């Protein structure tokens, strides 16, 4: 029972994929259809959905929530979840290098942390692409 959907598009509703990996804020986690119930905050990265069948899916997602209850119902909510093909690897590298260049530009600690979020998202994008 996998509930994966963006605010605009729906990927999986009650799907028995039984295996989902999420880029959590603290790190990475793996759902195994029996994983301990927990609430996990998403991090810039890609959700590699592994269905019960041998086929798998790879979607790069924005921040969000990984809500796996005591049961198998997992409600994965990603703000901007798209497949890797829609993205551009060249634009990915360009954005990463520009963000690295502008990291020191933001004198404010909060603003530099925001640009650090940007560079982290671009690095995860580069690794995914």
């Amino acid at each position: 029972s996998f509930t994966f959907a963006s605010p605009t598009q729906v990927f999986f509703n009650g799907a028995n994929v039984r295996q989902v990996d999420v880029p959590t804020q603290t790190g990475a986690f793996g759902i195994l259809a029996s994983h301990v119930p927990t609430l996990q905050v998403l991090r810039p990265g890609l959700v590699v959905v592994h269905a019960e069948d041998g086929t798998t899916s790879k979607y790069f997602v924005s921040s969000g929530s990984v809500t796996v209850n005591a049961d198998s119902s997992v409600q994965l909510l990603a703000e901007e979840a798209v497949t890797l093909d829609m993205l551009d690897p060249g634009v990915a590298k360009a954005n990463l290098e520009k963000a690295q260049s502008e990291l020191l530009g933001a004198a404010d600690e909060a603003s530099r942390a925001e640009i650090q979020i940007r560079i982290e998202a671009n690095e995860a994008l580069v690794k995914a692409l």
Partner: protein, 46 residues
């Protein structure tokens, strides 16, 4: 707690920044959908 959290950045701002990065990562072919998802219509009354 991270570099962004407990330093003046709300988690909603974190989500906005990463979502904008993902939208910019999209090619111009899918940029229309990203613009559609991007909501700047709501303004502020104070």
């Amino acid at each position: 707690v991270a570099y962004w959290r407990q330093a003046g950045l709300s988690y909603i701002r974190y989500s906005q920044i990463c979502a904008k990065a993902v939208r910019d990562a999209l090619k111009a072919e899918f940029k229309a959908n990203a613009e559609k998802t991007s909501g700047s219509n709501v303004k502020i009354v104070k």
